Design a binder for these strands. Structure first.
Lengths: 99, 94, 88, 105, 500, 91, 84, 106, 94
DNA sequence: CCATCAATATCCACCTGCAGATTCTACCAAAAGTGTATTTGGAAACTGCTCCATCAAAAGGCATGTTCAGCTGAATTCAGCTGAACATGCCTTTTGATGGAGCAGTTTCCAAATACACTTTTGGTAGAATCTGCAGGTGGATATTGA
DNA sequence: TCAATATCCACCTGCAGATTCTACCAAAAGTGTATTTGGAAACTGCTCCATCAAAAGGCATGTTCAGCTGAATTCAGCTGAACATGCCTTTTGATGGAGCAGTTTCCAAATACACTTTTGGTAGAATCTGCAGGTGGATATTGATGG
C-alpha cells in the first residue's frame, strides 16, 4: 500500500554523523587478521602476530581509509558530483604521491 | 619485569596543574606519552642536525631553541622559547 | 575430533562490502558506486603491502618469530603515518 | 639537595631528559641547560594540549579526558593541527564536517 | 574400463578440493592421528584412495556400489567428526561437490542420478500408548521393523534411534539397471506393467503412459475452483516465464461438532484443501490449510464464523518471489468466498511451529525458515492490508482490541474452536486475569470482520494427524524438490485410489 | 595548437623560467619582512628560484590533473585549492 | 638599505603562463595569476623564514645555499646541485 | 700494502665511508664490514643511475651526461622515481607528457 | 682553505667503467654528489635508528642490509643486498 | 570530407669558437693501513615465563540477498563571454666593474662538560582495599521528515 | 497541520578501570675531585655582496574572435531506503605448547693510540672539445582557400 520510506540521502547523512561522532573500529577483526596473516605468509612463514599489533594495523588502515575517502569525496565534489568513482581514488592517490 | 620507561607521573602532575579535577584514561595517557616521546625525538634530531651543520660536537640550549623555532608553529614556538628561557634563567640563578 | 592443530587464500575478499561502506561513511561519502569495493580492497592491499613488509623486515632482523606492536608502529612512523597509543 | 627539575621549576624530569639525550646518540656532548630547555618545552606543550583537552571535555559534558577529546582539541587548533599533520590517533575519530553540496536544498 | 572411465572425473573433482579432500586422501590411521576410538564407531573405515584402488582394479560391478561406498564414507566422516569440526565442513563440501558432479556423467551412463539418499531421522511412534514418541538417540524395542515400543512401555530386538532408512531402489524390466524410485517418479499402481527406462521407450516410440492420478483430475469444488481461478489470473497478469499452472482442490469436507470441555455442543463444517503447481512436468504440492466453518444455525457466539486451524506451505514454489503473493491470493480468495457465502467473522491463529513439529507436510526442508512470531504477525498484517485494498475485508483487528471494543465481560462470549488455545486457557483457569492473557497473546490471534459444496468423505485426510502418520510411515518427505514430487505423486495416488 | 607548441617547447628545455631580478627583489622584500640587514648569496638566490620553479611545476601538473578530472581543460582556483589540500599543505 | 615593497608583482603574467605551460596546462583563467603569486609567497614564507632562522643559529649575517638546502630538506623539498 | 677498498673489490672508498659514519654520530660502534657494505650499495646505485643517464644521453645523440638526461632517465625508471619521489634535480626538467585530452579532439 | 671531500674521483671511475666514452659535467657531478650524500644520510639514519631499536650499540652489515631492504624497493634492494653480501664475503676472505 | 598553395617552429646536415671539461707535474697535510694491548658487545646454552593459537558453544548484530523508485549521473544545445593569438610600443632585465661588510684563519685561556666513586632520592611496581565515571538499559519529552 | 520516527536527555544499576596506600628495591640524580676540551674573545687577510654604468631580450596593452564553459533540458538507470534471511564474530573459559626474554659464561670483534704509507683536492700551465647559435635548406603542419 503505502510503506514509510525516507528520501534517499537522509539515512546516509545520519550514518555519516553517527560514524563521525563515534570512534569504534568498523572493519571486522577476524577477516582483517586473516588478511594480515596471509600477507605476512606471502612475506615469510612462521611469523606470529600479537593482538596489539593486529589492533595497530586495524587502526592505521581505518585512519588511512578515512583520509583517502575524504580526499575522494573532495575530488568528486570538484567535478560537481556527490558520488565516488575510481577516478577520484586515482586522483587522490596520485596527488598524495603514493602512485 | 624490565623497567619500562615512561613520563606518566610528570604528565599527571601537569594535568593536575592545568585541570586539578580532571583525570585521564590509560589509552589517552599512552597517547600523551607517545606524543611527548615523538616531540623529544624530533627536537633531539633537529638539534643534532644543527650541531652537525656548524661542525659543533656539543648541543646547548641555543640548538634546542632553534629546533623549537624551526619545528613548532609561530605562537607555540614563541611560547616554548619564552618558557625555555625562563627555565634556563631559573636554573642558572638556582 | 581428529583435531588439535590447524590454505593461502580468503584474504582480499575478507574485507566485507559493509566495512568499506562504513569507512566511506566515516569519511563523509554520501553516495558510493557499486564498483568502488574492488579497487578499495586493492588500495588496502597496497597499504598492507607497504606496512607489513617493513614490519616483517624489522622482525626478521630482531631474530624474532613474532611480530610486535612496536615494530608495527615503527614501520608506520618510518612511512610518514605515525600512530599513537601502541608505544607501550 | 634539590633536583634539577625542582631547581628550574619544571615538573618534567631534567636529568631523565639528559639521560635520554645521552643514550640517543644525538651528539658527543650535551650541554647543561639543554635538558632543562627541552623539558620546559615538553611541559609547555603537554600543559597546552591538556588544557585544550579539558576544555573539549567540558564542552562534551565529560570529566575524563579521552582520545576523542584529544583529537578534537588537536584539530580545533590550527597550529596544533599543523604540528601533528602526519600523526595518526587511536580511537580519536574525525571532526564533524558535512560538505556544502551534500547538504539538502 | 567403461565404469572406471565414467567414474574417474567425479573422483578427481573430489580430490582437487583443497584442503577439503586432504584428510580423505589416505586411510584413517588411529595410531598416527591419536584416535583409538575410531574403530569403535566406524565399523567400515575406508577412504578415497581405497575408491581409486577399487576403480583401477575393477572391483565394482556397477556404479551404484561406488556411489554407496562414497556416501558411506561421507556418513562415517559426518558421524565420527563433530558438527563444529573442520573435518565435518570438509566432508560436507566434498558431498556437495560429488552431488553436483556425479549427476551429468551418471545420467549419460543411462541412469537417473548418482546419489545414495537416506531418509531423515524420523521419530518412531508407539502402538500401545498411542501417544508416545521415541526421540532420537534413545533406545527402543522393534519387532520386524514394523512395531515399536519405548523404554517406559516395556514395563523385540533392542535398537537405537540413530539409524537411517535408505531410499528404495527399482530395477528396469528390460535393461536391468538399478535407479532411485523417487528420481524417476515411478509408482506400481500408476504403471502396473512395470518400470521401463526412458531410453527403452525411445527404442519403442510410445512414450510413458499418461498418469490419471493427477491433481487436475481431482474432484472440483466451487471454493477450490475460485481459488485456482484467482491464482491462475494472478500468474497470467504477472506472466512469469518460470511460473506454471496451479491447481487448487478440496480433498476433504465433512460435518463435525465441538464439545465444551451455553450450548453443550457446537456443530461446524470442516474442509481441507491443497495447492498443486506444475513443476518440471509433474505436480508438486506447496500449500495446505484447514478451516472450521460455523453457519447461521450454530448457537452463539460461534454463529457464522470461519476459523483457520492449521496452515502449512512449501518453499519450493516457482518463482520464489511470487510465493508470498500466491499464498496471499489463496487466503484472500478464501476470505472472499466465505464472505460471499454469508459468513461474518474470521479467526486466524498466527502461531509459529515449534522445532521438529510439522503441521501438515512432514519433514520440512532443513533450509526452510521457521518464522518468528513477529514476522508471522507482519506477514498476516500485510496480507490483510492487501485484502483491504481490494475492498474485500471490512476490517481486521487483534483479539484483545476486538474484545475491549465489544465490551465482553463473560467467557461464554469467547469463540470456541476445536483444538484452540483459548478453550485450553479457560480450562486451566477454571482448574486453577483473562484480560491479561488476552493482552499477552494480543498479536498472536487475528479477528477479521467481512461485512454449497457437497461433502467429500476422506478418512485419510480427516485431520492432520492421520496424514502425518501416513507420511511418516511411508517416508513421504519434503526436504528436497524430488522428494516433494514423490510425496505429491504418492498422496495423489492415495487420494485417487483410497477415496470413500 | 600554439599552446601545445610552447607546452612542448618548455617541457623539452630546462632553462630558468622566472626572471632573476624580480625573484631576487621579492626574496629580499620577504626576508626583510622576516629580518632586516640580511645579505644574500647568488647561489642561494638560484636555489630559491629552482626550488620555486619545481614546486610551481608540480602544483601546475597536479592542477591540470584536477581540472581534467572535472572534464575541463582550463584550470580553476578550486583545482589549486583542492590539490594543495590533498597534498596536506592546507588541511 | 631601501625598504622593498610590492615586489610580488615581479612575477609577471607571461611567467606564470609559461610555468603553467611547462606543467601541461593548456588554458589559464584571468585570476589564476594572483592566486599563484599568493601561493609562491606562502612557499617563500615557509622556506626563507627557515633559512633566516638557520643563518641566525650560525651567528651569520649572510644567507648561504647550504642553509637553503637544509631548510628545503626539512620541509620535504630536497634539492640537488647546491650542496648537501 | 692493500687498501680495504681494493680488498673488497669495490671502487667506492671504504675508509672514507667509515670515517663519515664515525663523524655522523649515528652509533657508538661501527662494524668492520659496515663501510664495505655501504660502499657496495652506494657503488651499485651510482652505477645504475650513471648507466641510465648514459642511455638517456645516447637516445638524444649526446656524449656528455647532463642533468636533463639524468632526470629523464630516473623518472623513466619507476623504482628510481619512487626512490627519488621527493627529490628535485636542478636543470633537469620534466618528462614530455601530454594528456590525450590536451591533444586536438577533431 | 678547509678541504671539502667529495666522491668525484670514485663517481668518475664508476662512470668510466660503465660508459668509457661518456663524460660528465660539473652540474651533473654535483647532482651525483648530492644524491650519494643523501642516500648515505638516509641509510645511516635508518641503520642508527634500527640499532637503537634493538638496544644495540654496534652497527654491523646486518643492520645495513635490513635498512637497504627497507629503503630500496624490490629489484634495487635485492641487487644491493647481493652485492653487499658478496663484498663482505670478499673482505672477510682475505 | 579532404588534397593541398603557403607562412612558420624546428630536426637535423653542419661548424666553428669558447667556456667548460679534460691531461699533465708537484706538494703536502689529511686520511688510510698496519701493529699491539685493551675492552666489550654480543653469540651460545639453559631455562622461567607470558601471552600467542587453538578449540567449544550460543546468538544476536549486522552481512547477505531482493525490490521499488528518487533523483543522480550522464548526454545534448546553446549563448554570454572569458581568454588565446598577435601586432605595437618601450623598458625593464641582464652583464660587467668596483668599494668595503662580514666570512673565515690564528692564538689565549677560562667557564664548561666528561669519568667516575659513593650516597641519597626516587620511579616502577608486587599486592590488597576503597573510590569512582561512565557502560548499558528504561522511559518519555523533543526535534526531524515526509506527505 | 499532522502522523511516523530518530534524538536528546534524565535516571538508575552493575563493574572493569582509575585512583589511594603498604612496603620494596634497583635505577638513576646529585655531590665532590681531576682532566680535558668547545669555544668566547681579540686581531686580522680574504671573499664576495651591494651599488652603479650601459646594452638588450624580452614584457605590458589593446584588438579580434574561435572556442572553453556553465546554465538549461531531458532521461536511463544506479544505488539508497526498506525488508526478509540467516551468518558467523564475539565473548567467555580453558589448554598444549611454540616462542620471548632473563641469567650465566666467555670470545671474536671493535677501540685507542703510534707509526709508516698513500693520496686527493689544490694551484697553476697548457691542451682538447660539446655544444650554443647562426646561416642556408626544408619539412611536417596547420589555419585557410577552395573542390
Amino acid at each position: 500500500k503505502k510503506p514509510h520510506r525516507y528520501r534517499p540521502g537522509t539515512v546516509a547523512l545520519r550514518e555519516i554523523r553517527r560514524y563521525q561522532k563515534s570512534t569504534e573500529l568498523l572493519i571486522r577483526k577476524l577477516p582483517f587478521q586473516r588478511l594480515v596473516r596471509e600477507i605476512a605468509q606471502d612475506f615469510k612463514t612462521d611469523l606470529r602476530f600479537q593482538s596489539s599489533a593486529v589492533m595497530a594495523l586495524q587502526e592505521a588502515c581505518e585512519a588511512y581509509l578515512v583520509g583517502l575517502f575524504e580526499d575522494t569525496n573532495l575530488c568528486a565534489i570538484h567535478a560537481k558530483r556527490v558520488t565516488i568513482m575510481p577516478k577520484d581514488i586515482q586522483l587522490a592517490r596520485r596527488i598524495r604521491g603514493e602512485r | 619485569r624490565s623497567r619500562k620507561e615512561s613520563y606518566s607521573i610528570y604528565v599527571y602532575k601537569v594535568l593536575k596543574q592545568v585541570h586539578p579535577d580532571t583525570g585521564i584514561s590509560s589509552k589517552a595517557m599512552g597517547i600523551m606519552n607517545s606524543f611527548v616521546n615523538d616531540i623529544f625525538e624530533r627536537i633531539a634530531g633537529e638539534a643534532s642536525r644543527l650541531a652537525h651543520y656548524n661542525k659543533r660536537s656539543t648541543i646547548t640550549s641555543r640548538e634546542i631553541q632553534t629546533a623549537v623555532r624551526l619545528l613548532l608553529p609561530g605562537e607555540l614556538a614563541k611560547h616554548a622559547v619564552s618558557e625555555g628561557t625562563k627555565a634556563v634563567t631559573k636554573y642558572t640563578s638556582a | 575430533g581428529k583435531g588439535g592443530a590447524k590454505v593461502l587464500r580468503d584474504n582480499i575478499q575478507g574485507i566485507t562490502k559493509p566495512a568499506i561502506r562504513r569507512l566511506a561513511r566515516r569519511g563523509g561519502v554520501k553516495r558510493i558506486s557499486g564498483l568502488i569495493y574492488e579497487e578499495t580492497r586493492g588500495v588496502l592491499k597496497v597499504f598492507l603491502e607497504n606496512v607489513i613488509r617493513d614490519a616483517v623486515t624489522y622482525t626478521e632482523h630482531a631474530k624474532r618469530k613474532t611480530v610486535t606492536a612496536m615494530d608495527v608502529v615503527y614501520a608506520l612512523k618510518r612511512q610518514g603515518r605515525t600512530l599513537y597509543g601502541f608505544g607501550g | 639537595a634539590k633536583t634539577r627539575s625542582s631547581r628550574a621549576g619544571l615538573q618534567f624530569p631534567v636529568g631523565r631528559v639528559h639521560r635520554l639525550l645521552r643514550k640517543g646518540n644525538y651528539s658527543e656532548r650535551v650541554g647543561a641547560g639543554a635538558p632543562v630547555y627541552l623539558a620546559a618545552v615538553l611541559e609547555y606543550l603537554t600543559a597546552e594540549i591538556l588544557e585544550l583537552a579539558g576544555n573539549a571535555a567540558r564542552d562534551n559534558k565529560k570529566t575524563r579526558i579521552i582520545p576523542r577529546h584529544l583529537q578534537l582539541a588537536i584539530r580545533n587548533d590550527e597550529e596544533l593541527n599543523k604540528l601533528l599533520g602526519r600523526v595518526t590517533i587511536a580511537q580519536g575519530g574525525v571532526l564533524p564536517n558535512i560538505q556544502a553540496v551534500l547538504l539538502p536544498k | 574400463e567403461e565404469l572406471r572411465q565414467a567414474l574417474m572425473p567425479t573422483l578427481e573433482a573430489l580430490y582437487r578440493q583443497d584442503p577439503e579432500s586432504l584428510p580423505f586422501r589416505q586411510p584413517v590411521d588411529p595410531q598416527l592421528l591419536g584416535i583409538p576410538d575410531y574403530f569403535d564407531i566406524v565399523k567400515n573405515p575406508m577412504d578415497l584412495s581405497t575408491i581409486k584402488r577399487k576403480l583401477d582394479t575393477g572391483q565394482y560391478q556397477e556404479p551404484w556400489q561406488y556411489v554407496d561406498d562414497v556416501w558411506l564414507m561421507f556418513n562415517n566422516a559426518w558421524l565420527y567428526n563433530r558438527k563444529t569440526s573442520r573435518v565435518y565442513k570438509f566432508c560436507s563440501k566434498l558431498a556437495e561437490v560429488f552431488e553436483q558432479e556425479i549427476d551429468p556423467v551418471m545420467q549419460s551412463l543411462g541412469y537417473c542420478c548418482g546419489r545414495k539418499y537416506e531418509f531423515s531421522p524420523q521419530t518412531l511412534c508407539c502402538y500401545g500408548k498411542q501417544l508416545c514418541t521415541i526421540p532420537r538417540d534413545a533406545a527402543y524395542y522393534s519387532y520386524q521393523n514394523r512395531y515399536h515400543f519405548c523404554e517406559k512401555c516395556f514395563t523385540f530386538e533392542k535398537k537405537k534411534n540413530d539409524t537411517l532408512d535408505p531410499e528404495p531402489f527399482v530395477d528396469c524390466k528390460e535393461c536391468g539397471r538399478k535407479m532411485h524410485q523417487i528420481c524417476v517418479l515411478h509408482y506400481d499402481i500408476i504403471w502396473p506393467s512395470g518400470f521401463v527406462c526412458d531410453n527403452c521407450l525411445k527404442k519403442t516410440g510410445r512414450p510413458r503412459k499418461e498418469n490419471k492420478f493427477s491433481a487436475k483430475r481431482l474432484q472440483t469444488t466451487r471454493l477450490g475452483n475460485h481459488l485456482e481461478d484467482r491464482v491462475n489470473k494472478f500468474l497470467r497478469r504477472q506472466n512469469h516465464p518460470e511460473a506454471g499452472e496451479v491447481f487448487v482442490r478440496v480433498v476433504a469436507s465433512s460435518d463435525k461438532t465441538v464439545e465444551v470441555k451455553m450450548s453443550e455442543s457446537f456443530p461446524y463444517r470442516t474442509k481441507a484443501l491443497f495447492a498443486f503447481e506444475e513443476i518440471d512436468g509433474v505436480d508438486v504440492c506447496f500449500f495446505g490449510m484447514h478451516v472450521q466453518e460455523y453457519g447461521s444455525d450454530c448457537p452463539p457466539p460461534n454463529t457464522r464464523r470461519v476459523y483457520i486451524s492449521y496452515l502449512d506451505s512449501i518453499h519450493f514454489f516457482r518463482p520464489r518471489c511470487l510465493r508470498t503473493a500466491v499464498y496471499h491470493e489463496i487466503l484472500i480468495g478464501y476470505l472472499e468466498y466465505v464472505k460471499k457465502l454469508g459468513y461474518v467473522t474470521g479467526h486466524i491463529w498466527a502461531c509459529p511451529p515449534s522445532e521438529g513439529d510439522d503441521y501438515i507436510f512432514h519433514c520440512h526442508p532443513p533450509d526452510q525458515k521457521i518464522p518468528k512470531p513477529k514476522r508471522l504477525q507482519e506477514w498476516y498484517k500485510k496480507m490483510l492490508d492487501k485484502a483491504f485494498a481490494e475492498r474485500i475485508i471490512h476490517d481486521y483487528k487483534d483479539i484483545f482490541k476486538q474484545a475491549t471494543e465489544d465490551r465482553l465481560t463473560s467467557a461464554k462470549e469467547l469463540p470456541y474452536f476445536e483444538g484452540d488455545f483459548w478453550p485450553n486457557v479457560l480450562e486451566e483457569s477454571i482448574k486453577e486475569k483473562l484480560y491479561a492473557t488476552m493482552e499477552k497473546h494480543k498479536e498472536v490471534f487475528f479477528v477479521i470482520h467481512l461485512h454449497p459444496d457437497p461433502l467429500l468423505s476422506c478418512d485419510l485426510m480427516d485431520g492432520r494427524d492421520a496424514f502425518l502418520t501416513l507420511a511418516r510411515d511411508k517416508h513421504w518427505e519434503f526436504s528436497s524438490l524430488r522428494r516433494s514430487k514423490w510425496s505429491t505423486l504418492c498422496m495423489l495416488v492415495e487420494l485417487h485410489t483410497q477415496g470413500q
